């Protein structure tokens, strides 16, 4: 984690467990966050709008009322 601000902003990346030279590319981290975002948001009472991963856009909004 880097660049912690009072805005509650910061940057993060991920590395392999016992290898500081291995950095998981962003694409895999984006896919992982997309998979577990419902759980990560619920762990912080956040709702995707409140918890924003810049570069990762929420795409799950199904609208339907009158069939």
């Amino acid at each position: 984690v880097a660049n912690l601000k009072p805005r509650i902003s910061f940057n993060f990346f991920v590395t392999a467990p016992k290898n500081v030279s291995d950095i998981i590319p962003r694409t895999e981290v984006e896919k992982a966050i997309r998979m577990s975002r419902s759980r990560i948001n619920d762990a912080f009472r956040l709702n995707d709008n409140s918890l924003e991963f810049l570069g990762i856009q929420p795409t799950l909004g199904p609208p339907n009322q009158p069939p």
Partner: protein, 66 residues
């Protein structure tokens, strides 16, 4: 003749008033036209009127309007 077309439009909006998220509340997944301006401006000119760009441009009787 024209006051009964305006009442025609009023009762089209009264029939569409039975939906918790009223149909002029959100954008149709999002139409660039609707994305510009607002959903309300989109429900009137497209969803309700299917309006043209000129008086020289007439088309098909809007069945729901009829």
């Amino acid at each position: 003749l024209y006051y009964n077309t305006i009442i025609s439009w009023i009762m089209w909006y009264l029939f569409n008033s039975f939906q918790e998220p009223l149909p002029w509340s959100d954008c149709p997944l999002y139409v660039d036209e609707c994305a510009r301006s607002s959903p309300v401006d989109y429900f009137w000119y497209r969803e309700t009127l299917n309006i043209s760009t000129s008086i020289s441009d007439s088309g098909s009787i809007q069945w729901w309007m009829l």
